[PDB]
Design an enzyme around this catalytic site. Structure first.
Site, PDB file in Angstrom:
ATOM      1  N   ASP A   2       0.793  -1.239   0.000  1.00  0.00           N
ATOM      2  CA  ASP A   2       0.000   0.000   0.000  1.00  0.00           C
ATOM      3  C   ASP A   2       0.829   1.296   0.000  1.00  0.00           C
ATOM      4  O   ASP A   2       1.355   1.674   1.038  1.00  0.00           O
ATOM      5  CB  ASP A   2      -0.926  -0.034   1.226  1.00  0.00           C
ATOM      6  CG  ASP A   2      -2.081   0.948   1.135  1.00  0.00           C
ATOM      7  OD1 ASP A   2      -1.913   2.098   0.654  1.00  0.00           O
ATOM      8  OD2 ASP A   2      -3.191   0.579   1.579  1.00  0.00           O
ATOM      9  N   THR A   3       0.894   1.986  -1.147  1.00  0.00           N
ATOM     10  CA  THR A   3       1.624   3.268  -1.299  1.00  0.00           C
ATOM     11  C   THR A   3       1.013   4.491  -0.566  1.00  0.00           C
ATOM     12  O   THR A   3       1.690   5.490  -0.362  1.00  0.00           O
ATOM     13  CB  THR A   3       1.874   3.673  -2.832  1.00  0.00           C
ATOM     14  OG1 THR A   3       0.654   3.645  -3.598  1.00  0.00           O
ATOM     15  CG2 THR A   3       2.863   2.745  -3.470  1.00  0.00           C
ATOM     16  N   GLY A   4      -0.252   4.412  -0.161  1.00  0.00           N
ATOM     17  CA  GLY A   4      -0.873   5.530   0.529  1.00  0.00           C
ATOM     18  C   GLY A   4      -0.943   5.382   2.040  1.00  0.00           C
ATOM     19  O   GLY A   4      -1.658   6.138   2.702  1.00  0.00           O
TER      20      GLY A   4
HETATM   21  C1  LIG Z   1      -6.343   6.751   3.711  1.00  0.00           C
HETATM   22  C2  LIG Z   1      -5.229   5.745   3.455  1.00  0.00           C
HETATM   23  C3  LIG Z   1      -5.492   4.374   4.114  1.00  0.00           C
HETATM   24  C4  LIG Z   1      -4.760   3.998   5.427  1.00  0.00           C
HETATM   25  C5  LIG Z   1      -4.131   2.725   5.562  1.00  0.00           C
HETATM   26  C6  LIG Z   1      -3.502   2.387   6.774  1.00  0.00           C
HETATM   27  C7  LIG Z   1      -3.489   3.286   7.848  1.00  0.00           C
HETATM   28  C8  LIG Z   1      -4.098   4.530   7.726  1.00  0.00           C
HETATM   29  C9  LIG Z   1      -4.740   4.906   6.522  1.00  0.00           C
HETATM   30  C10 LIG Z   1      -6.510   3.384   3.519  1.00  0.00           C
HETATM   31  C11 LIG Z   1      -6.083   2.459   2.561  1.00  0.00           C
HETATM   32  O1  LIG Z   1      -4.882   2.660   1.901  1.00  0.00           O
HETATM   33  C12 LIG Z   1      -6.937   1.382   2.240  1.00  0.00           C
HETATM   34  C13 LIG Z   1      -6.513   0.390   1.305  1.00  0.00           C
HETATM   35  C14 LIG Z   1      -7.365  -0.696   0.999  1.00  0.00           C
HETATM   36  C15 LIG Z   1      -8.628  -0.797   1.600  1.00  0.00           C
HETATM   37  O2  LIG Z   1      -9.437  -1.862   1.287  1.00  0.00           O
HETATM   38  C16 LIG Z   1     -10.822  -1.657   1.584  1.00  0.00           C
HETATM   39  C17 LIG Z   1      -9.059   0.189   2.535  1.00  0.00           C
HETATM   40  C18 LIG Z   1      -8.204   1.284   2.857  1.00  0.00           C
HETATM   41  O3  LIG Z   1      -8.666   2.225   3.806  1.00  0.00           O
HETATM   42  C19 LIG Z   1      -7.808   3.233   4.104  1.00  0.00           C
HETATM   43  O4  LIG Z   1      -8.164   4.033   4.919  1.00  0.00           O
END
Ligand SMILES: CC[C@@H](c1ccccc1)c1c(O)c2ccc(OC)cc2oc1=O
Lengths: 97, 99
Positions: free
Chosen positions: A23-25
């Site tokens: 996960d890049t974000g």
């Molecule tokens: C806002 C960025 C984020 C996040 C990840 C870990 C800790 C804090 C925030 C986020 C995803 O990258 C994501 C990826 C896949 C997913 O699948 C349903 C759901 C997701 O929900 C999210 O809040």
């Protein structure tokens, strides 16, 4: 890694096998299931939909993508296993157009 | 261009003309942005993130300009704490994770 399929791989954290998502974000890494010990410091992480309480551990051995690194990891009740930018950079990965 | 990941991969795009700052996310399947109104056909959806569920509205066939490229894609809009472009848009751009 093309993005036509989810970038899911298998990682070995302190010897335990798990399937994580690249996960890049995500700024940190949360995984569920693993048991890491009694040296943690509580944290509160928040994303879409709300917050999640996690327990933080530093310097954990991780073997994934044929590499062995040492990074910080969070265990908690997350609905999906995530390896964020912290491990990704340490591993040397990039995002290219 | 290349994005090292020592900093968040954040960029500007235009949803049917309007500029917004978004984050490139490889772990999400869909795309969601806050504060934009469109005229495309829409249908209500509920997405579940890492913390809980959120109410949304989905639009089909929206035109987006990102990184000097144009595509017609599906996007959701609602009160999200962070705007993101998921894998449905990244694949249509040709991005890839390298190692
Ligand atoms: C806002 C960025 C984020 C996040 C990840 C870990 C800790 C804090 C925030 C986020 C995803 O990258 C994501 C990826 C896949 C997913 O699948 C349903 C759901 C997701 O929900 C999210 O809040």
């Amino acid at each position: 890694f093309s993005l036509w399929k989810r970038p899911v791989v298998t990682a070995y954290i302190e010897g335990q096998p798990v399937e994580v998502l690249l996960d890049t974000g995500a700024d940190d890494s949360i995984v569920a299931g693993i048991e890491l010990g009694n040296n943690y410091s509580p944290k509160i992480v928040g994303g879409i939909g709300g917050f999640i309480n996690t327990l933080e551990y530093k310097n954990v051995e991780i073997e994934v993508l044929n590499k062995k690194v040492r990074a910080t990891i969070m265990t908690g009740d997350t609905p999906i296993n995530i390896f964020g930018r912290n491990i990704l950079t340490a591993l040397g990965m990039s995002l290219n157009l």
